[PDB]
């Protein structure tokens, strides 16, 4: 039920359950230019029933949405959606 990271072709695509449906959906990322802030936006453009929604380090401290998805893929991370957390587990990837 958690949230998963797969490289698919080159690229990192993030499958989550989202609140609205037991369908879970995937969200394939460019790395070199999309952010954090464009992953979080397509997640609530995804589902209205997204209220919050929030990346953390491990260690519990708020990515900044101008941060690139390469470099967040470069360790885990937490996503919060509403009142759930996920811990996520990128594969490790170079740099
Ligand atoms: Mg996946
Ligand atoms: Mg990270």
């Keep these: 039920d958690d949230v998963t990271v797969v490289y698919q072709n ?6 989550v359950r989202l609140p609205s449906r037991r369908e879970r959906c995937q969200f394939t990322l460019k790395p070199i230019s999309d952010s954090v802030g464009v992953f979080l936006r397509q997640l609530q453009e995804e589902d209205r029933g997204i209220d ?43 740099l």
């Design 52 to 94: 919050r929604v929030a990346i953390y380090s491990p260690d519990g401290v708020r990515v900044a949405a101008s941060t690139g998805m390469d470099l967040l893929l470069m360790d885990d991370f937490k996503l919060v959606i509403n009142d759930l957390t996920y811990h996520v587990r990128p594969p490790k990837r170079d």
């Design 10 to 15: 080159g690229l990192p695509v993030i499958s």
